[PDB]
Chain length 144, copies 2
């Protein structure tokens, strides 16, 4: 069981914490936490390739795409590893997140440790995905 | 991984950017950048185990020590993987960093990506369990760079 965590921050009101837990080698990755200050509705949710916050979320590069596949949704075969779809903010601007994903990993080639988790301005249209600006982001770190 | 980067921030004026480059996976790592807002003199410089900044620098946990060694300085053989010694800030509070280390790595079981780089209030005593370098002034998670 490996664990990771990400503190999402940006230049506006969006902020939150997302936890990752992988009980087994190459096993499903639980992803859960809360993001607040969002506009009500859907927000694109992506792992971007670089854990580089030197230029804020802009330096995070493109979607984590180690397999040079096309963009899609977490249910799509043809997707980027970093394609986690959308989070939904409630009427109070809070997106309580709880999913499971089998394409990301906390080990090996699909590993997301050291990359950047990003929450977006708009919905991902899921097949990039036209989710608009990168509102908050953080480097995915190893957690106890 | 051949390059990594870390943005150091805290609650005070200390801030900086540190870059890592490792040409060969079994070779040394070059570490370079600049930290500003420091008091003049030596400041402990460590990789802590967890890349968890949910509680700022405190949640980074202890020195990264996957090889079960005792605390030392970077040129000691008895050291933690995270023991990068001290950075030195000049009279303007600026610590220019440019070193090479052969214990940290950007891959494998000495890998420091996804862990926390920390700069401290005062000097690491280099072994003469933590080095007594005082509070954690700034930190960041070490991320994969292009
Ligand atoms: Zn994105
Ligand atoms: Zn994508
Ligand atoms: Zn320390
Ligand atoms: Zn140590």
């Amino acid at each position: 069981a490996t664990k990771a965590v990400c503190v999402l921050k940006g230049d506006g009101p969006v902020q939150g914490i997302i936890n990752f837990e992988q009980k087994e080698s190459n096993g499903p990755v639980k992803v859960w936490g809360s993001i607040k200050g969002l506009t009500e509705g859907l927000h694109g949710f992506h792992v971007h390739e670089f854990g580089d916050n030197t230029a804020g979320c802009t330096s995070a590069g493109p979607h984590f795409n180690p397999l040079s596949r096309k963009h899609g949704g977490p249910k799509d075969e043809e997707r980027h590893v970093g394609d986690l779809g959308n989070v939904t903010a409630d009427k109070d601007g809070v997106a309580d997140v709880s999913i499971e994903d089998s394409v990301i990993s906390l080990s090996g080639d699909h590993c997301i440790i050291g990359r950047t988790l990003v929450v977006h301005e708009k919905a991902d249209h899921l097949g990039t995905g036209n989710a608009g600006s990168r509102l908050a982001c953080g480097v995915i770190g190893i957690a106890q």
